Design a protein around this ligand. Structure first.
Ligand SMILES: Nc1ncnc2c1ncn2[C@H]1C[C@H](O)[C@@H](COP(=O)(O)OP(=O)(O)OP(=O)(O)O)O1
Ligand SMILES: Nc1ncnc2c1ncn2[C@H]1C[C@H](O)[C@@H](COP(=O)(O)OP(=O)(O)OP(=O)(O)O)O1
Lengths: 790, 790
């Protein structure tokens, strides 16, 4: 029982190795019967248990008991379910034919797309994209366009092609020939391309390709060269992605995005569907309040509105079922009136073409309240923390979170909320039909139960001081989800029971007020061993994080932002050498670092550095050692924060992208004189100096010292004018693109001098500059404009 | 546990017998899901372990323990993976339609192929071949040819036929009829051949057959007789092989080989692809250095250039992703932008039609540096050594390495570097996309890991005196890979740990300098038992190879070339009788052999014989016993090296092919008089006498004494003129084809006398003969020419 402990280890290390590979195959299988989905549904929990207890291999007898009992469990369920598979022996389309009476107003978009199609001869081959989420109006606006009369006056051959998510090239191109009027010839591929090329000479053709996905998309540029150019032809690709809109490369302007319906438009849509007997009109007025409540709760999608209309069409129009459907809503559209209309299938097919890590990343958004506005940064740090992101080829921590987030937003699953001047995204939200889809998929494998026992991670809402959330010992994550402004009122015993979870990788506490100081609350985090992230942002009783933080050897990131009382950072955040993000933004009262910051090397984000004094903290000398970082945040207080021969400490950062300088609590002119030798690298994408007590430019702000600057913002400051190296217009220019001047009451410059010094501007967002009165925006003084040029 | 030792042996001998036969089937299977590829990936390692420990059957209790534990391991993984297969239930083409705007210059090749097609009436049926590696420009140059207007003026029926690697005859010939304009008739085969013959009377036809492979190719001469001749028809076969170019037998001159792109041409190709928005022009100049670095690193293939262009087309054109793709390159084209363009598939399909021994032989080229120029001889000896080559029917050692190497170079996987006068190949290299393809296939089964633990063989680069290469106990081979000029600086402990590997079949040390003499370094090679090859060429501390070489009973070849200090060869290289190659070329200080060289009989190559004196070494008498050799190398020093009645020792070598005579350190005229009785056999393919102190011809150099001589070279010498038997032009002639006269300052003859005495010459390469001034080359004196006649 002890001598075989390695052997009875390693077969488990084999068996997990097979079974998750089996769980990379069964979801790629169509026609899933009930036994298949049930044994996948418990093999996922069994995978969680196996890789849960497998980490304990890093007496040697109780572990052998655990290995033995779970091996017997897995072999028993295999031999228990296999004869049921021994016993038994083992479509979506579209069309240009629609009804044109229930189409609630689209005539502005119809007009815009018709004036887009009238300019087809201006390009060689006008291609267009209709990008939006599932069931939004894309195929209907396409059918509304090219069934108009004026398009048939313009285009003489109109071709509809229904490309499903499952297809082949052969049926696509022979369907093109069937729409061309040629007979269905049993024929091979190159002859079909020759025929498609031959039937399109001198003909102003319009093809509309529907439901184009990003799966084996290379067929596009096996037929894109087969289309004749210069004839004024036009392609309209309707799809659910911007990634295919750039792979087809329509244009950034030729993409049309349909919008959600207004409540008046959605209400007469629902009248036209549900009350279809008496001419689409409401007959009895006791249903109008409940009906308008249902319609305003459907929130804009025509698919859900027509589904609820088809659901209520087979009732007797009495008040009680209407009222209960108004208060029980999600549970019926997931029954689909027992599988007839299938809204959930039309969104689940958009779910079911993600990569598996993106499936895991989109699955965690079932953990948030009703319409909360989710910050990007917390999602990205959770994904990096509990391991939904892998990396080897340099795309290590932050940029992999960036392209996973952009991969989700390019599937039209997550929509943005606000965007800065520099195009980066800070907050995002999701449509609620996607939200309860992801909840119902979390109602499977024990990702997010949230009722009952078996959960793998949990999210806390507001004010659980008294409601006593159940917490079992599985708990791979604990997140704090607030609805943009509330604070989770928490007591002490829940935070004590957080430290009882052995397997807890994500612990982020974002808006919470505790009863005791957090030094003795989290004193037993030595019991936490495989913890990857901590964002202890915005907590009241935090003064000193606990001193039992020596055995946390994993600790991939460490966040504490906007906590104004953080006096001492311990010297134990030096030795563990496996850090990625250290993030202290705007933490005022802070003794500005420990010593060996340059000792750990694998970190990428270092915000709020506060370079220390002589016999204090750490200087800027070891920043030369940090050859992997790409975001860096400085904040300066007085003159002796920086040292003379360290003033060239920012030239050897090869992979650096952005710099933020926070000279908020500045003291003397010595700081102003000593800033001007800090030279950024010649590669630099964004810089944001934001309080800057100097009066002139910092004397490196020139295209000679940093040529590749694209985005730039200047917040508040004592800045009066720019020096002569700031223009430098003999032959060099900025190649800068986004510029922001937030609150400057002393800054004076011109506008055409900027336009002859910055030839590549797009937008300039200035909103408090009472002294220019020469820019093209509506007022550079009190309010703000953007100057979105052509 | 002991009485069943035979039984528990032999079932393993059965089980390996099944499982590798299973591993001769699963790679012939399409639609490989994840569980299939994972259990193939560990059954390969399990095959290596099974046949690794199976050789130990030649106490009897520990071996029974080993047999028992691996049998339990194999049966456990079988019963562990079988229910996952119980659970689940179980295209490439081309066209004459292309874009003709991105085609970067081919007008010289287009012109040459058009003047080839203009001479179609000169032959009965002009057939042509386009031979090159995968993704080079073959189908594009074919499309560029027969979509020209003048070809349609010439040929009235142009037929494109896309023959994939998976096909049938029926679809090929009905596609021929579909291109002929006949309707797609559901019809059988002989009627289709009759129709194809009937539609081609009096019609100047052009057919282009694309991607023709060497798999069931007999369909060619089931339709080659069906094509009408004398009409001026033309066939263009584009393919990836010269073997099919000779099986179709186009001509040796009618084959066109496209070349890699120039850096200017590849740069405007990359501009035309990547910057496709603004007319294929670069817009911002900070990307030109990184862009040209990527383009010059892609090295000529249009496929990789258009793949990198399609990869960078979906980015935001900022500097940082461009720079990291410039420094992380291979890891993205093996993700294929998550399987959309698939360069790796287009080369892996060329990998996946090799025979399995050729798969193993091509797999070992993942063991070399970036662009090193690999000698043929080391590869061939490694393949013979560790057993990728089997032989029974006389093709025993060297010629099987020759036709395996020619089989790899005829797939356009390995390209040549330099070639001698006699057409034989000495050094070869590979394109780097093939190289990291073979690395990624070695990233599978533990052939070549090279990082981490599990390796089956290892290759050392330069200067590992201090870097301490990890070496586990598996290690079936250890090769030394140098980049044409460096020497692997090695210490003593690595060479001591080489002798710790129990299972080591290939040990070749080609460019290394050691610290201690190799007599005591390799003293414990008695621990080596299954060692097959040793090339101890070019090592400094080698004076005497160690005397523990009595138990090496396998030792298939033994090489030590260009090691100038090798005094004594031990008498233990007589008794082991299983030698193939003994190769001492140019080893100066050497006591010229042991005695029983004629005792061992199964050897093929014996270079640098140095025939001994009377009571010394070995004479030429036992060379009559060596009835299997085909390459033989003599080197002569003075007169008593050879004996009188041994002067007919070279007439009974039936299978001999080549003779090299090295009379470098010659002494007296007695050697010149005693050479002239050494008569080669009447079959002789190449001879190279190279220092030859005599003044006349050796008096056997005549078509009477050796009729079948084809290739011949004469290096430096005191030779003045040729005797009258050297011409012999009454009716006999040389039938010689390649001739080389390297550095002769006394040799005088004519040119038209050679042309009337050697009617079958092709090239005569003379480069230092200051005294002829009558040959057709540019200068027979200081420089050299080749005289490549028509
Ligand atoms: N403006 C509209 N007026 C009335 N019904 C509409 C309108 N737009 C859409 N619909 C209805 C028609 C269908 O019943 C349903 C789905 O429309 P459809 O065009 O298929 O969605 P879509 O094309 O945006 O998504 P998908 O790509 O999944 O098809 O919505
Ligand atoms: N001269 C060229 N100019 C521009 N693109 C080219 C040129 N030659 C080849 N290409 C591009 C076209 C395709 O995108 C890609 C593959 O070329 P292609 O001719 O299909 O390969 P090939 O015929 O040499 O081998 P294979 O048929 O085995 O792929 O290379």
């Amino acid at each position: 029982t002890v001598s075989d402990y390695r052997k009875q280890l390693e077969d488990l290390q084999s068996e997990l190795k097979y079974m998750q590979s089996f769980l990379k195959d069964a979801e790629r299988q169509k026609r899933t019967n009930e036994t298949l989905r049930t044994l996948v549904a418990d093999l996922r929990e069994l995978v969680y248990e196996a890789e849960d207890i497998l980490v304990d291999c890093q007496l040697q007898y109780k572990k052998s008991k655990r290995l033995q009992e779970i091996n017997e469990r897995i072999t028993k369920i295999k031999s228990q379910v296999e004869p049921y598979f021994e016993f038994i022996t083992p479509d979506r389309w579209s069309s240009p034919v629609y009804d044109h009476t229930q189409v609630v107003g689209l005539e502005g978009d119809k007009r815009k797309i018709k004036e887009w199609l009238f300019r087809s001869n201006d390009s060689q081959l006008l291609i267009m994209a209709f990008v939006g989420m599932g069931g939004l109006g894309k195929t209907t606006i396409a059918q509304e366009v090219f069934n108009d009369k004026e398009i048939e006056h313009r285009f003489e051959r109109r071709i509809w092609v229904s490309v499903s998510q499952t297809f082949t090239e052969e049926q696509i191109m022979r369907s093109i020939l069937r729409n061309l009027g040629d007979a269905s010839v049993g024929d091979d591929i190159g002859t079909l391309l020759r025929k498609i090329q031959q039937y399109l000479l001198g003909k102003r053709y319009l093809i509309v390709m529907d439901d184009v996905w990003d799966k084996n998309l290379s067929w596009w540029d096996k037929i894109y060269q087969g289309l004749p150019r210069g004839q004024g032809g036009s392609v309209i690709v309707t799809t659910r992605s911007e990634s295919v809109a750039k792979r087809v490369q329509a244009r950034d302007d030729k993409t049309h995005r349909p919008e959600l319906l207004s409540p008046d438009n959605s209400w007469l849509l629902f009248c036209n569907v549900a009350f279809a007997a008496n001419d689409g009109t409401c007959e009895r007025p006791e249903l109008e309040d409940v009906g308008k409540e249902i319609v305003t709760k459907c929130k804009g999608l025509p698919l859900t509105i027509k589904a609820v209309g088809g659901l209520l069409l087979c009732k007797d129009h009495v008040y009680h079922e209407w009222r209960r459907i108004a208060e029980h809503f999600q549970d019926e559209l997931r029954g689909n009136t027992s599988e007839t209309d299938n809204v959930m299938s039309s969104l689940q097919l958009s779910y079911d073409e993600l990569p598996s890590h993106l499936k895991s990343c989109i699955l965690t958004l079932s953990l948030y309240p009703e319409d909360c506005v989710i910050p990007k940064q917390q999602l990205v740090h959770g994904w990096i923390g509990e391991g939904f992101v892998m990396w080897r080829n340099g795309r290590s921590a932050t940029e992999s979170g960036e392209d996973c987030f952009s991969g989700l937003t390019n599937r039209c699953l997550i929509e943005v909320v606000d965007k800065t001047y520099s195009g980066t995204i800070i907050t995002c939200k999701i449509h609620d039909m996607v939200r309860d889809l992801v909840i119902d998929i979390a109602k499977k494998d024990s990702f997010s139960n949230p009722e009952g026992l078996n959960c793998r991670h949990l999210g806390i809402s507001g004010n659980f001081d008294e409601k006593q959330i159940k917490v079992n010992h599985k708990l791979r994550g604990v997140v704090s989800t607030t609805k943009t402004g509330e604070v989770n009122k928490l007591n002490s015993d829940l935070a004590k029971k957080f430290t009882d979870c052995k397997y807890l990788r994500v612990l982020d506490i974002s808006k919470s007020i505790f009863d005791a100081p957090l030094s003795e609350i989290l004193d037993e985090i030595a019991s936490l061993q495989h913890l990857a992230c901590l964002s202890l942002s915005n907590t009241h009783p935090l003064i000193q994080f606990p001193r039992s933080m020596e055995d946390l050897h994993n600790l991939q990131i460490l966040d504490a932002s906007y906590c104004q009382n953080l006096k001492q950072l311990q010297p134990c955040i030096v030795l563990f050498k496996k850090l990625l993000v250290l993030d202290m933004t705007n933490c005022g009262s802070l003794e500005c670092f420990p010593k060996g910051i340059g000792s750990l090397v694998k970190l990428e984000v270092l915000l709020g550095f506060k370079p220390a004094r002589s016999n204090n903290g750490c200087k800027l000398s070891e920043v030369k050692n940090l050859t992997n970082l790409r975001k860096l945040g400085l904040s300066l207080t007085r003159g002796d924060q920086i040292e003379e021969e360290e003033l060239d400490s920012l030239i050897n950062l090869s992979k650096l992208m952005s710099i933020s300088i926070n000279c908020y609590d500045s003291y003397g002119d010595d700081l102003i004189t000593k800033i001007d030798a800090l030279t950024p690298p010649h590669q630099l994408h964004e810089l944001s100096l934001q309080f800057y007590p100097g009066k002139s430019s910092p004397s490196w702000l020139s295209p000679h010292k940093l040529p590749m600057l694209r985005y730039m913002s200047i917040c508040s400051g004592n800045l009066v004018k720019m020096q002569e190296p700031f223009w430098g217009n003999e032959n060099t220019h900025w190649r800068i693109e986004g510029l922001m001047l937030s609150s400057l009451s002393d800054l004076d410059m011109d506008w055409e001098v900027l336009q002859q010094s910055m030839p590549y501007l797009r937008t300039v967002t200035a909103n408090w500059c009472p002294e220019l009165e020469s820019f093209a925006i509506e007022d550079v003084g009190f309010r703000g404009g953007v100057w979105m040029k052509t």
